[PDB]
């Protein structure tokens, strides 16, 4: 009863999906379990960092163990598919 909001965009479409998740925090195979379509994929995920020149990069991630960074409450992904 306590949630994250993820949100993620998938394989190219610009408008996102957004769904809410339970507990506090989100691995990327609680991520994967969302996602509707089957394959292989690369796992990109928001997160602020102070190294780069604008604020942001997408993180990847691969390990269905992981925690996934939040940015500004939110999680929010890019899935892209392996041509
Ligand atoms: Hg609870
Ligand atoms: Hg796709």
Known sequence: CDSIVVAY???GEPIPYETLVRGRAVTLGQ????LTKKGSYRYYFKKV????DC???????????????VFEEKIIGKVEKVD
């Open 49 to 52: 960092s102070d190294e780069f």
């Open 9 to 11: 965009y998938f394989c």
């Open 31 to 34: 991520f994967k379990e969302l």
């Open 55 to 69: 604020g942001v990069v997408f993180e990847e991630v691969r390990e269905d163990e992981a925690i996934l960074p």
